Amino acid sequence: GTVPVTWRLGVDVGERSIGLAAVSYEEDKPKEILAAVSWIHDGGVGDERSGASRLALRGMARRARRLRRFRRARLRDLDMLLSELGWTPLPDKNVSPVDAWLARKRLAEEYVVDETERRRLLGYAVSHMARHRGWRNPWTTIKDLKNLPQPSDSWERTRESLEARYSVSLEPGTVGQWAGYLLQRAPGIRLNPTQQSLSNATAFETRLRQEDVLWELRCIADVQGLPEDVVSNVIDAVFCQKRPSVPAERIGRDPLDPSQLRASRACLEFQEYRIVAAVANLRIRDGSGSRPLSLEERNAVIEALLAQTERSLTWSDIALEILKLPNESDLTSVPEEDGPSSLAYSQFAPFDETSARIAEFIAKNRRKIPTFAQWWQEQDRTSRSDLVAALADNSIAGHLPDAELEALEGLALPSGRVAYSRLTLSGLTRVMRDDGVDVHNARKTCFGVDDNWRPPLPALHEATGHPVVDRNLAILRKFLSSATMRWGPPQSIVVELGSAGGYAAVALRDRLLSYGEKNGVAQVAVFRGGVTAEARRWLDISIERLFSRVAIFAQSTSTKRLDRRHHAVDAVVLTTLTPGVAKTLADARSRRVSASTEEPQSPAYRQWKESCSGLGDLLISTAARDSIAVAAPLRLRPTGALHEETLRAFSEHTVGAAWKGAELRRIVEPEVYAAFLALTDPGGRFLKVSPSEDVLPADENRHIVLSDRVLGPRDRVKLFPDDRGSIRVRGGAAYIASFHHARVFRWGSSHSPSFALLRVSLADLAVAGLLRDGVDVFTAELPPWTPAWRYASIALVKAVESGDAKQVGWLVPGDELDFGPEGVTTAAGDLSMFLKYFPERHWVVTGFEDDKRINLKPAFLSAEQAEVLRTERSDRPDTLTEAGEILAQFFPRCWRATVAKVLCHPGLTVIRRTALGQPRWRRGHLPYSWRPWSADPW
RNA sequence: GGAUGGCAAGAUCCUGGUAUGCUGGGGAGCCUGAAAAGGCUACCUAGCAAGACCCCUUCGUGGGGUCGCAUUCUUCACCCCCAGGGGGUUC
DNA sequence: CGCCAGATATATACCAGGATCTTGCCATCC
DNA sequence: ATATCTGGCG
């Protein structure tokens, strides 16, 4: 099913863009531009302000959820404990604002005598402290919090500042005490600071630490005389904090045994493996050499490295101080099978890092470690191996003496993971020692692998977790699968990168090399990071002329970034490059910028031009027939923020009062909403009212019959705060999220119909319960109470209630509006003078401003270039072309078009592209392009 | 230009916490007001996506145990990759 | 009052340290 | 950057 042709793939990776091109070569010149499209992705950013990524927002929301749940959990565990302890927490409703604080201060100043009344105040104070327990290093334990400066310097520092400003010192004094006083003298003072952006004096500088809070907790137990048993348990309960840990899914897999995770660097299996593998690859000059080490000599040097407690033995010392070899150069090492060989004799040989650090800790703190010193002396390393892997797994989760363990945390162990698992290291070590065999051949002996084999390269169908690299990668492999099915696999692949992009180079390249070693691609080249612009501007290929575009700045300049199609043409020109040719071009580039300068010319470059002279004309041909396409991937998966995060207070409106259109849309209860829906039209399905106009009179005796109960004219119904699409969450009102998509309805004559939009949000899908599997999210009648219908166009809702309006298509943020050679005809206002300078026919949907308008930006222009322009005219005016002023005033809002004045083009086609940047016309399972004018519903 | 040792810096996330914010329930103090009922500054408490399941059931119509804003062509379909995952779909 | 066009409202900000990566620098050996 | 808001406009 594949038409085989000789072609090469070109990739120009951008920060928010990726230009892809397939160019066929007859031997040996480019003839036909098979595909050339620049996809405009988002760089993986979720919040455009403070550019945090989508995944970051998910994880922050995710951990926020578990924090609340663990906080709920641990607070209830404390309450269950202090139940049998006899105490009483603060009730929520009716207590004094300062009950907990007065407690925390009284118990530390006065000893209350009566035992029963002491219990109630004990409960109040501990409840609030558990609700406000302060910060501490989560990696530490509760007993470690006990062994801290109590109180801290920062807390004493804060207390000194307050004494100087308000001229008062409080014995002793704890933090609970100071709060209850400072709210009295200068009322309205805030305890801990915060900023949400004027004139006030605050009470504290820094956050309170759990060590300072524990200081107050231990003082009160002293003053009130509490037994150790009760006080030790309640301290361990209020400061109970889950100990952080790495998940088992985020440790890499062993490439040799994917059933086991990578071992820790501090592992003893690892230290021995490194030393045993290094010696098995050593060779000694025996002639006319060389030969591997004799079994005896190998064992002798291994043990000398294992025993040392410092990294002193070098490779020169290995050859001389141990084997007594005559010269240092008589011993070498090889890192590949029968391959080149070197060895820095001044560099140090490996040693057992973990055992040496264990040695230094026992040698320094043997008093803290007497039993383990005696123990670890004669214990063999077969047990130490399991022990140290446990040490790595306790220092991150994931016989032991408790008394000793607490002092064992002042030892610094090797952090980080290593390539292989623990059992893989152990097995490879035994075979390199027992059969005297290479590491590369130890693989073959243990695990079925040919010799040699490099660890498998990451694939195209595997992510990197880095958001900008994964956006680029996703578009890339889709384009390549489409190209490899539509055409043959390429001859070469050339890639260009515009710093951060550093990971992207290695990740994309090594993934592409797996592709090539799988499909059979000869040459795979990457470049950093400006070879493609020179390749153009040395063949008279300037994109400001390739598409007829106006100048922008007062001085004439190359408007490279202006048109988003350049990424694709850069991809096209890269198909003519090979590593040697690209650098010999970049070198010439450097030779001009320094000083002189004369020409170009080299057998590689004259060959290039003779083969590449033709592209000067193909891009002209391709731009004329408009073959270069801008595309944006579509977001269809109905996941994301369901509603804005601000909870809001309801309004209320009595049943008997007068109702206006705005008040009826705002009715919260869906069943009460349907009640008033009948009271405005008994035979109507939808609300046909316009706000700011009464539609029901002030019936003194208005009633609403409901399945639950009927409300009298004195009863009140809850209303949302504002006449805008909202829902109810957890007893509050929340605005809808931004619109997931839009449904395109139409009615009227065939030859002159009226269209309008129904703006569908993620909130709509939730309350309509349309998030279950097996739902089409774009085509499913949304109940009339959903906010989509509540704020639809009044003309739209009148025609659909009349059976006249039918769903004809759907639009989504990012798809294309091609008005054809007809162009924008209903031009008016600032748009008119816009098209005189930027004759744009392709537009992209960015938003849905109201129930009657749709937001469009031009498909070919970049926001970043014109945003610079907007900042340009406000600080240095007169330094732009008249077209510059046009474009600067245009882009902030771009186009705010009335949907009726848009979809009325017969005329227009909304395009949905393939990966190759070609429009879908077939009504396949994938989304496809259609015409709003003549589209019909099945 | 390759090999090796070491150092330093940055990126992407992940885990567990803090402090606020908003809404509800509250009331310490205060200001506009003849009021009457607010709103002004703070503080106590509960929750912080909607929800889909589980688990234990002593059947409490209820307790605790997770998932829930990423993977940009949902749902349906058919070609792949190693019994669930991961991919691609040419106009 | 209808319709633009500019203005405005969105939860936010920290903490230590694991896992996964990349650069930049120094040096010694083919 | 988007869907609202307000205010000035005719």
Domains of chain A: 7-48+463-628 (3.30.420.10), 56-238 (no CATH), 262-446 (no CATH), 812-911 (no CATH)
Query: Which residue is it, tokens 């937001």?
Result: A855
Are A283 and A290 within 8 A, CB to CB?
yes
DSSP for residue A312: -
Q: 3-state class of A643 per DSSP?
A: strand
Q: Which contiguous run of DSSP H or E holds residue A263? A: strand A262-264
Are A898 and A890 within 8 A, CB to CB?
no
Decide the pairing of beta strands A492-497 and A523-528.
Answer: parallel
Are A440 and A452 within 8 A, CB to CB?
yes
A49 C-beta less than 7 Å away from strand C: yes
DSSP for residue A740: E
Helix (H) and strand (E) counts in chain A: 34, 25
C-alpha to C-alpha distance for A849 and A843, rounded to whole angstroms: 16
Per-residue CA distances from A23 to A27, A480, A526, A539 (Å): 13, 13, 17, 17
DSSP for residue A318: I
Query: Which residue is it, tokens 């809702």?
Result: A797
Q: 3-state class of A525 per DSSP?
A: strand
User: Residue A627 phi/psi, 5° resolution?
Assistant: -75, -20
C-alpha to C-alpha distance for A505 and A439, rounded to whole angstroms: 30
DSSP for residue A29: E
Are A651 and A718 within 8 A, CB to CB?
yes
Are A857 and A814 within 8 A, CB to CB?
no
DSSP for residue A321: I
Torsion angle (degrees, nearest 10) of CA A101, A105, A106, A109: 180
Closest by CA to A813, choosing from A741, A870, A866, is: A741
C-alpha to C-alpha distance for A483 and A490, rounded to whole angstroms: 9
Buried b (16+ CB within 10 A) or exposed e, A750-770: eeebbbbbbbbbbbbbbbbeb
SS (H, E, C) A211-248: HHHHHHHHHHHHHHCCCHHHHHHHHHHHCCCCCCECCC
C-alpha to C-alpha distance for A719 and A738, rounded to whole angstroms: 21
Using the C1' atom of nucleotide C24, identify the protein residue whose alpha carbon is closest: A499
Torsion angle (degrees, nearest 10) of CA A775, A776, A778, A784: -40
Closest by CA to A111, choosing from A223, A230, A26, A268, is: A223
Closest by CA to A42, choosing from A462, A475, A465, is: A475
Are A898 and A754 within 8 A, CB to CB?
no
| CB contact set of A671 (below 8 Å; sequence gap of 6+) | A706, A707, A708
Which residues surround strand D, with CB < 7 Å? A 48-49, 722-725, 736, 738-739, 759, 791, 846-850, 855, 863, 893
Per-residue CA distances from A338 to A281, A437, A518, A746, A816 (Å): 10, 13, 26, 75, 58
For residue A929, give both structure tokens: 């392009």
Using the C1' atom of nucleotide B25, identify the protein residue whose alpha carbon is closest: A93
| CB contact set of A522 (below 8 Å; sequence gap of 6+) | A491, A492, A516
Q: Which amino acid is at A580?
A: G
C-alpha to C-alpha distance for A151 and A154, rounded to whole angstroms: 9
| CB contact set of A562 (below 8 Å; sequence gap of 6+) | A544, A549, A552, A861, A862, A865
Handedness of CA A270, A271, A274, A275 (dihedral sign): negative
- The gap between A61 CA and B26 C1' (Å) is 29
A142 C-beta less than 7 Å away from strand B: no
Give the angle A695-A696-A698 at the CA atoms, nearest 5°.
Answer: 135
Closest by CA to A757, choosing from A792, A782, A722, is: A792
C-alpha to C-alpha distance for A14 and A140, rounded to whole angstroms: 43
Closest by CA to A767, choosing from A741, A787, A790, is: A787
DSSP for residue A410: G
Q: For residue A891, count other CB atoms closer than 10 A to its CB.
A: 19
Are A764 and A784 within 8 A, CB to CB?
no
Chain A 34-63 residues in 7 Å CB range of strand B? 35, 41-44, 46, 52-63
A346 C-beta less than 7 Å away from strand C: yes
| CB contact set of A32 (below 8 Å; sequence gap of 6+) | A23, A24, A618
| CB contact set of A419 (below 8 Å; sequence gap of 6+) | A254, A255, A262, A455
- The gap between A65 CA and B65 C1' (Å) is 15
Helices A566-574 and A615-624, axial angle in degrees (round to 10): 150
Method used to solve the structure: X-ray
For residue A423, give both structure tokens: 């059992």
- A567 marked ligand binding residue: yes
C-alpha to C-alpha distance for A876 and A857, rounded to whole angstroms: 26
